[PDB]
Design a protein around this ligand. Structure first.
Ligand code: FAD
Ligand code: FAD
Lengths: 488, 490
C-alpha cells in the first residue's frame, strides 16, 4: 500500500489537513490511535479567523448552527474583554463550539472528500530516504508498513513522530498545576463568573457554564490520572466545600508547560498542531493555531506532491508558521504569570488592566488571539500583503457574491476590479492552479481593497500580490511563479 | 522662634516646596540633617513635566544649560524607548541633569527668595495642637525648639516625621536586593550596555556610562540594612561576574531594593508629607525626584494660601486627594518593572509581550505620558475635557507681540487667560485680582493647540486647568471655580 501523504492523528489538525490535501488531489491516509472518537471536549470554541477559513471552504454554516457567539475575548481573566468588533470581518466574535462537534464536522468533510480514515491504527516507527517514507503501523488487523511521499505528525503534544525524528522540543517547565472537571453541582457556586481567589494559598478555583447546569471547574496551584477524589480534595482545600459535585463528564490535569519544536520539517516528514507546540490553554488558541497550521501546510504540500510547486514552497510552511506559534507561547507565558495570585504580580496585573483599556492595545491583543492580524513576510510595500483577504461583497452580473464562495476548491484566486483585462492573459498559463474572479467592483466603499484594481490570493486566503492603477501588472508573473510554480 | 512653615529635609522636594511657599508669602524654615550638600547624584535627570514647571517659574534656562536631551525613555530595560515627541510640549524629552546640579539650582532660588536654610539641623520630635506645631531640633550649636503653623516632612523614604506621626507606610516587601556604585573600572566591561547575566544565581550585573570612563554599576539579586562598603560591592561583583574589574575612584555606594510603600495619608493635622517621605518604590524609569518635585508644586500654593488665610478650608485636603493616585501610578508601573527585570526565564513571555506592546504607538504614548507626567489628570467634578490637565506653554498673540504662556506664572498666582475682545470676564474676576492675573490675548499663535475651541481658561498656580469657556458656554462657572480654588471674593 502506497499513498501520497500519511497523517498520524485524527484530532482537529489532522482532520483539516486531510481535507486540504484532498482539495489539492493527494491520495491521503489518516491513522488514528483511538478506536472510537473521544467523548469530552478540550476546546470549547473557534476564533474569528477559523470561522473565516471554514466559510472559505463552505463549512462555516455547519459550525454556526451551534449558535453561541462570544463577542469579547479573555486575556488572563483581567475583566477587560478583547473586543473583536474593531475588525473588518463578517465574524467579529468567537463561536462556542465544543471540540467533539468540531471533530465531527471535520470528519464528515474529510470522508466526503475521500480521505481514508483508519481508527485504532498507530504509527510506531518511520524510515525516510530521498524517494519517500515507510511508516510502521499497528492496527486491529495486525502490524503492517505503508509507503508514502510524505508523512505528517498531527499526533498531539506527546507526538510519537516528533520523538521518532529526534526533533528537540525546547521550552519551559511548568510553574502551575491545575485539575479540571466538567461536572454538575448540587450546591450553589460562589460569585467571582464563579470561583474563589486564594492569594495566601497561591491557588484559585474558577468555574463557568458549559450547557445549563454543567460547569468546567478548574483548581490551579502555583509554585497518574486525576480522579474525582483529587478534584474534590482540591475543591475542598481551596473553596472550602465539595459543593456536592456529581456526574463528572471529564476530569484532567493542566499545566503551564510551554514548548515548541526546533523545526517543523525533517526531510519528508512534517509536524503540525500540538505536535509542534504546547502551551498553557489561555485565551483558547491551540485548536485554532493547529487548524491554521493545517490550512497553511495543506495546499503547499498538495502542490509539492502534484509536482507543480516551486521547490522552496514547502519550506515556507515552517518559516511562516513558527513565528505564529511563537506568538501564542509568548502571550500564554505572559498570561501564566498574570493569573498567578502571588501579590508580587499586583502592579503587573493593574498595569495590564490599564493597558487593556487603551483601544489600540486592546486591538493588538484581540488581533493576536483571534488570529485576524496574522501577517506573513511578503515581497512589496502595500499594507495588505501577507494579510488575509476580507470576505468582500463583490458586485458582478447575476448580483452580489461573497469573495469566500470562490475559495471552496482551495485554488488561488486572482481578483480583478475593473474593465482592465491584460491581467487575465498574463495569468492564463496558471489557469489550472488559479481562478480569475472578475468583479465590476466591491459592494462596499469602505473596503481595505478600495485603491486597488487587482489582488492575487493564496489558497489559504493570504494576499501575495496587489495592483493599483499606477503599478500595473508588475510582479504578477513573479508572484505567480513564487507561489504557484512555473507556467503552462 | 516662630515661622509659618517648617520643612524637614533639603532634598529636591524640600527645596522646591521652600521656593513655592516663598512665592506664596510664607516665612519658611528649612532644616537639613547634612552639614554640607552631598557630592553624588541619585537622580540623573528630570522629565518633561518638571522642565515645564521650572519654565513656569523662570528657572528652566538654568537647567537646560546642562544640555543632554534624552528624547526616549526607559521601561524595564526592554530596548523600546518611550517616545516623548508625541506630546504637545516645548520639551519632548527628558534632560540629563544630575541631582547635585538640580539641588544647587533649587538652593540658589530658595535662598534668593528668602527661605532660611539650616544645614546640620535635624528634627527629633514634634508636638501638635489646634493652634500650631512645636518642632524639636538638634543642630551644631545644640538642641532647640521652633514653633510653626505647619510642618512638612520632606525627609526621604526613611522619614523621621512620618514615623513620629505614627503614619502607616503600607506596601510590599522586597523581592530584589542590589548594590550600586558610581565608579571607574581598570578592566574592560563585558557586553550585557555592560553586564553579566546569571540565571543559576537569579542575579545580574549591569553598568552604564555616567560620563566618559565613569559607570553606574548595579549588582541585583532576586528572591541588608547596614550601609554598603566598597568590599560589599566588590563581593557582589565577584559573586556574579567572577571579578571586580579593577574598580577604583568610587564616587558613591548604596543599597537598592524593589520595596514599594506609600503613606496611608499625606496629612495628620498640621503636619504633611511630600516626596520620598510618602512614597518609596524601585528606582525604574527615573520617576521619584519628578514625583516629589510635583508633590511640592501641588502643596506649595495650597499651603501658602491656607497660611495667608485666603484659601477655602477644604483646599489643603485636595493635596492628598490629588497626589495619592499619582504616586499610586508610579508604584504600580515600578512594581510591574520589578518583575520584568527579574532574570528568571519564567518572565520571558512577559518581557517579549511587553516589547511587542511597546511597539504599539498608543501603548508607547500611554506609558510615556505616565513616566514623563505629561498626562497627569486630577479629578474635577466638572465636565470639560481639559479640566484637571496641564496648560500647554502656548505662544500667545498679544499687544506687545507674542509671548509664551509660561512667562505669566513666575509669581505662582492663578491665571485667567482670555482669547478674545470679550471683557465681561475681567469684571467678574476683579474681586480675585490679588490672587489671579488676567492675561488678555488676541489668540494662540499656533493652530494645533488643545485650547483651540476655547475663549477662556482659569489656570491654578501649578499649571492645572480648573475652568474653561467656549463661545457657546460663556462665563458660566467662573465664580464657582474662583471660589473653589482661590477662596472668597475680596
Ligand atoms: C483544558 C483545555 C482547554 C482548551 N481550550 C481551547 C479552546 O477553547 N480553544 C482552542 O483553540 N484550543 C483550546 N485548547 C487546545 C486544543 O484542545 C488543542 O490545541 C487541540 O486539541 C490540538 O489538536 P491536534 O489535532 O493538534 O492534537 P490532538 O487534538 O491531541 O489529537 C492528536 C491525535 O493523534 C492521535 N495519536 C497520538 N499518537 C498517535 C500515534 N502514534 N499514531 C496515530 N495517532 C496517534 C491521538 O489519539 C489524537 O487523536 C484547549 C486545551 C486544553 C487542555
Ligand atoms: C539609584 C537611584 C536612581 C534614581 N534615579 C532617578 C532619576 O533618574 N529620576 C528621578 O526622578 N528620580 C530618581 N531617583 C529617585 C530620587 O533620587 C528621589 O526620589 C529623590 O531624591 C527624593 O527627593 P526627596 O527630597 O523627597 O528626598 P531625599 O532626596 O531623600 O532627601 C531628604 C532629605 O531629608 C534629610 N533628612 C533626613 N532625616 C532628617 C531629619 N530628621 N531632619 C532633617 N532633615 C532630615 C536628608 O538628609 C535628605 O537631604 C533615583 C533614586 C535612586 C536610589
Amino acid at each position: 500500500m502506497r499513498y501520497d501523504v500519511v497523517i498520524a492523528g485524527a484530532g482537529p489538525t489532522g482532520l483539516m489537513l486531510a481535507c486540504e490535501l484532498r482539495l489539492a488531489g493527494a491520495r491521503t491516509l489518516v491513522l488514528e490511535r483511538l478506536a472510537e472518537p473521544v467523548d469530552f471536549s478540550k476546546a470549547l470554541g473557534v476564533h474569528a479567523r477559523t470561522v473565516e477559513l471554514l466559510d472559505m471552504r463552505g463549512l462555516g454554516e455547519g459550525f454556526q448552527a451551534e449558535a453561541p457567539k462570544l463577542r469579547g475575548g479573555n486575556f488572563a481573566s483581567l475583566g477587560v474583554p478583547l473586543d473583536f468588533s474593531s475588525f473588518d470581518t463578517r465574524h467579529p466574535y468567537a463561536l462556542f463550539v465544543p471540540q467533539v462537534r468540531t471533530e465531527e464536522l471535520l470528519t464528515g468533510r474529510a470522508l466526503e472528500l475521500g480521505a481514508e480514515l483508519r481508527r485504532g491504527h498507530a504509527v510506531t516507527a518511520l524510515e525516510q530516504d530521498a524517494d519517500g517514507v515507510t511508516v510502521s503501523v499497528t492496527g486491529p488487523e495486525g502490524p503492517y508498513e505503508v509507503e508514502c511521499a510524505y508523512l505528517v505528525g498531527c499526533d498531539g503534544g506527546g507526538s510519537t513522530v516528533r520523538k521518532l525524528l529526534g526533533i528537540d522540543f525546547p521550552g519551559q517547565d511548568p510553574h502551575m498545576f491545575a485539575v479540571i472537571a466538567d461536572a454538575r453541582f448540587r450546591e450553589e457556586l460562589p460569585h467571582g463568573p464563579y470561583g474563589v481567589m486564594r492569594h495566601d494559598l497561591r491557588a484559585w478555583f474558577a468555574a463557568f457554564p458549559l450547557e445549563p447546569d454543567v460547569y468546567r471547574a478548574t483548581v490551579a496551584f502555583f509554585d497518574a490520572p486525576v480522579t474525582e477524589e483529587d478534584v474534590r480534595a482540591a475543591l475542598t482545600e481551596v473553596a472550602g466545600s465539595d459543593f456536592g459535585m456529581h456526574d463528572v463528564r471529564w476530569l484532567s490535569r493542566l499545566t503551564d508547560t510551554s514548548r515548541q519544536a526546533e523545526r517543523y520539517r525533517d526531510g519528508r516528514v512534517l509536524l503540525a498542531g500540538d505536535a509542534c507546540h504546547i502551551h498553557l490553554p489561555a485565551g483558547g488558541q491551540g485548536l485554532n493555531l493547529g487548524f491554521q497550521d493545517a490550512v497553511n501546510l495543506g495546499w503547499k504540500l498538495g502542490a509539492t506532491i502534484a509536482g507543480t510547486a516551486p521547490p522552496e514552497l514547502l519550506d515556507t510552511y515552517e518559516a511562516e508558521r513558527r513565528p505564529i506559534a511563537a506568538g501564542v507561547l509568548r502571550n500564554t507565558r505572559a498570561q501564566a504569570v498574570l493569573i498567578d495570585p502571588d501579590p508580587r504580580y499586583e502592579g503587573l496585573r493593574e498595569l495590564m488592566i490599564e493597558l487593556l483599556h487603551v483601544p489600540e492595545t486592546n486591538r493588538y491583543l484581540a488581533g493576536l488571539i483571534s488570529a485576524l492580524d496574522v501577517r506573513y513576510p511578503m515581497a512589496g510595500e502595500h499594507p495588505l500583503l501577507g494579510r488575509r483577504v476580507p470576505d468582500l461583497p463583490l458586485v458582478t452580473e447575476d448580483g452580489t457574491r461573497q469573495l469566500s464562495t470562490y475559495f471552496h476548491a482551495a485554488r488561488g484566486v486572482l481578483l480583478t476590479l475593473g474593465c482592465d483585462q491584460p491581467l487575465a492573459d498574463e495569468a492564463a498559463a496558471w489557469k489550472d492552479r488559479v481562478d480569475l474572479v472578475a468583479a465590476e467592483g466591491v459592494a462596499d466603499p469602505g473596503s481595505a481593497v478600495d485603491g486597488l484594481t487587482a489582488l492575487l490570493v493564496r489558497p489559504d486566503g493570504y494576499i501575495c500580490w496587489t495592483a493599483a492603477p499606477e503599478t500595473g501588472t508588475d510582479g504578477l508573473t513573479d508572484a505567480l511563479r513564487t507561489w504557484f510554480g512555473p507556467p503552462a
